[model samples]
Target: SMEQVAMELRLTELTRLLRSVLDQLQDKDPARIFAQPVSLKEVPDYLDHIKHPMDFATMRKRLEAQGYKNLHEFEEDFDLIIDNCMKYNARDTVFYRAAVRLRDQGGVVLRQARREVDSIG
Candidate 1:
């Protein structure tokens, strides 16, 4: 009898913001591996080490499925991608170093999204 639920923040705006951020993340990934899921065969024991696996492709699907409630929901999985890379790879490995830069860039994107989210007010 009460489906409007219009009190919720604007998903349209957040969806666009998240999409933009994800695209930038894809382009900025130094190793380009972040755009897709990790290969279990290549890494081996990846699942054993990482309790949860997240990737850009998977995130996009979740995003379209309306799985995110806010910017932080999107950011949560965004952080996981970089974190997983760091955890699975050695500190000296290229994947780990790339995650370092990706992590920094992710913050900048989120900052921009927050600004956009508040601009209407």
Candidate 2:
């Protein structure tokens, strides 16, 4: 329990540091960076379109314009989106597709895990 608590504290500190760096990088609220809301309904097609590395270059540019300097800058939002989509068991969604792709590419492992813990469980 102590180790878990320590891990949480360290994660919180890391989050704050990341937020501060992102704050210094751009003008708009980092939380409000997406130009359009990423609805789960659209993630299937979204993943299909973004399959190419060239598409990611465009994505990076758009993110930069929105004040997200790198992929990690969007990780928080991505985790939210991914977790939300996972609940639907939408196996074709972007998160699922990417996880499969990452596994297939080698040198990485994907595990199914809860994004949050239920305090009363």
Candidate 3:
């Protein structure tokens, strides 16, 4: 629930920021700006640790430094964030874009989901 809240807040903030840029560009020549990457206009800064890992300080800084001032840049950052989070949680949690059916990757069939039945054990 908390994660969802954080994600919502960040999304809201990004939308607002993007809107500001679009409004600003509305008066200018549209053709020139259309060629620019959209994500570059707003750097993603969601507080959700799942989306932005706590340990990924350097990567976050790099993303910020790259200057996601347009939508395309933002999309790239979002993809990178998703990839990192997926890798971070793959061993301990099911992390994916869509829902996944629980599978017994190990030899045992998990009749009970509460217990920590180690794959090695």
Candidate 4:
């Protein structure tokens, strides 16, 4: 049945997306939980690992060429892309998904951290 097949396909895709979301949270600095134990040296490596199509270093080079000297400048461009994606329902696009996962995971982590802190205090 096409309906059953479509059901299974959606389930499979959701499973993969969840797994990738977890992986991105674990491997990338911006996506990680704040209370998680990542070393200072790991930050750049995490950043380096997260880029798709173009590696992070190359992306940074490109950003620099476009006069983005820091993350603040770079994120302005990133947000623009994400906003444009929203105009056409491109939420499943790689970058948009990454951004969503990053923000959602960060909030989850931060809330947990706040609870722990409140308990301690």
TM-score: model 4 vs. ground truth = 0.28
Which candidate wins on TM-score? 1
lDDT of 3 by residue, 10-113 (tens): 65554445344333432232333222232323534433333443222332344344343334444344344345545544545544321122111211222221
lDDT of 1 by residue, 65-118 (tens): 767877778888988998888878899988888899888877787788877767
**Cα lDDT for residue 5, candidate 2:** 87
lDDT at position 24, candidate 1: 83
Model 4, residue 1: C-alpha shift (Å): 74
Which ranking of candidates, highest lDDT first?
Answer: 1, 4, 2, 3
Candidate 3 displacement at residue 11 in angstroms: 0.3
Which residue pairs clash within candidate 4? none
Model 1 stretches with alpha carbons more than 4 Å out? 1-9
> Per-residue alpha-carbon lDDT of model 4 for 5-90, expressed as tens digits?
87666555444433333344345545322223223364545434333222234333453343433334433443433343344336
**Any idea what lDDT model 2 has?**
0.39
Kindly give the stretch of ten consecutive residues in candidate 3 with the minimal lDDT sum: 98-107
**TM-score for model 1?**
0.84
TM-scores of the candidates in the order shown: 0.84, 0.29, 0.27, 0.28
**Clashing residue pairs found in predicted model 2:** none
Give the whole-model CA lDDT for all candidates, comma-separated: 0.80, 0.39, 0.36, 0.42
Error of 4 at 48 (Å): 33
Model 2 lDDT tens row, 29-48:
22333323444485656554
Tell me the RMSD of model 3 versus the true structure. 20.5
